[PDB]
Structure 1
Amino acid sequence: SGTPPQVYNFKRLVFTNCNYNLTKLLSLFSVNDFTCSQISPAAIASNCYSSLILDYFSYPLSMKSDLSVSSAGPISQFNYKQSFSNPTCLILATVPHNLTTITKPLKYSYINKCSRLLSDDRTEVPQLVNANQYSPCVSIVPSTVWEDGDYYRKQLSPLEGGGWLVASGSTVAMTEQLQMGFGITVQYGTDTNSV
């Protein structure tokens, strides 16, 4: 339901004390690309866990090679991260033609740089967004980016370290059909084993 959000705006859903099945879900998914790291394709539809976390976002196939864990692209720099502490799965899918419940946003986008300067206007340090974490650039970058290289800026309070936070975003136009991406991470002992 609704419009999928940007890759730097990844919506997370957590599942606990319930039952799941991909065959009732993945059948209506036009899965373009299917990868899983530290886990088998059959495990996510067969094995039992303690809890599930699934992050979904809008993601085209143009920056497909940036799905790698060790990739250093801006998507893997200031937009989305993956946890080294748990096995992961990556899904790249497309809206089915006989599926109009979902909606399409204006354009794909991501953040090409996210670094913070200090009050002295001479020292600049990039911040590294952590695994399953959100950069402070998310707090100032809007949900959509109007055009490639859009610039955003904000003043930071001295109690928050002072200086300024600046960022720039880049855009990729829509294809014939909307493409989106999902990341799946499992948890085995983080609570009662019930899923």
Structure 2
Amino acid sequence: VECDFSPLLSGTPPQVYNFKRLVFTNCNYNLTKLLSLFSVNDFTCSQISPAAIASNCYSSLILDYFSYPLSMKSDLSVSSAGPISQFNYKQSFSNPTCLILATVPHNLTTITKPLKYSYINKCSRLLSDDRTEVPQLVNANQYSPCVSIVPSTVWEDGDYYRKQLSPLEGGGWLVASGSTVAMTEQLQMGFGITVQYGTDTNSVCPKL
């Protein structure tokens, strides 16, 4: 009956373009207990307050977690034209959302660090024209098409990736480019909470 937060606290967090998603239904959470394990640097919310989201009932609660540097805070808005919201990760507006940038402390030894932070700064498709480019903007709550070609961690800032397509996939090429950010002393992560309301299925409630 307790919401399983375990996969977030163990292993290496994926990059922003490969965010892992925990879907919580029919359970009971203590969110403040989870955020107490970290060092919360920024906690903003939309269509809901942070104080409420740790204390209300929903039919379903989704928690996306990934590796994210605190220097690119300005880029994790959804009213932004940055590469993060363009090609990597984007939250939906039709339901309350919350965004949390946290830092793994010394007391949390069960989360491993990767070599560096990595994000996509270009993910477009070249048409059978071989002249026409159609930038592949990611949709809300979805993965970019270029996750098929961009590896789990960009080896070097500037690496470009390509994949020729069959006529049944639209022909032409799928094309992407990588970029990196230096790793910090302690791991810097981001969390995206997104709640939904079913009719009789108000099942995810904080415990007492």
TM-score normalised by length of structure 1: 0.97
User: Residue 81 of structure 2 corresponds to which residue in structure 1?
Assistant: 72
Distance 2:199 2:140 in 1: 17
> What RMSD over aligned residues (CA atoms) do the two structures have, in Å?
1.1
Contact 1:51 1:190 in 2 (8 A): no
Q: Deviations over 1:29-87 (max 9, x none)?
A: 11111111111121111111101000000000111101212111001100001101111
Does 2:125 align with 1:116?
A: yes
Distance 1:26 1:191 in 2: 29
User: Residue 49 of structure 1 corresponds to which residue in structure 2?
Assistant: 58
Distance 1:67 1:190 in 2: 31
Offset at residue 23 of structure 1 (A): 2.6
Pair 1:150–1:43, CA change in 2 (3 A): same
Offset at residue 24 of structure 1 (A): 2.1
Distance 1:56 1:13 in 2: 8
Offset at residue 190 of structure 1 (A): 6.9
Partner-residue secondary structure (3-state), 1:56: strand
Q: Which runs of 5 or more structure 1 residues have no equivalent in the other structure?
A: none
Distance 2:133 2:32 in 1: 49
Offset at residue 191 of structure 1 (A): 7.0
Offset at residue 154 of structure 1 (A): 0.4
Q: Which runs of 5 or more structure 2 residues have no equivalent in the other structure?
A: 1-9
Q: Deviations over 1:86-109 (max 9, x none)?
A: 111000011111221110001001
Offset at residue 120 of structure 1 (A): 2.5
User: For this pair of structures, how many residues does the alignment match?
Assistant: 195
Distance 1:191 1:73 in 2: 39
Offset at residue 193 of structure 1 (A): 1.4
Offset at residue 135 of structure 1 (A): 1.4
Partner-residue secondary structure (3-state), 2:16: coil
Distance 1:25 1:81 in 2: 23
Taking only the aligned residue pairs, the percentage that are identical comes to 100
Structure 1 consecutive aligned stretches of length 4 or more whose deviation exceeds 2 Å: none
Contact 1:5 1:11 in 2 (8 A): yes
Pair 1:190–1:141, CA change in 2 (3 A): farther
Distance 1:76 1:129 in 2: 8
Partner-residue secondary structure (3-state), 1:110: strand
Q: Which has the higher helix share?
A: 2
Does 2:163 align with 1:154?
A: yes
TM-score normalised by length of structure 2: 0.91
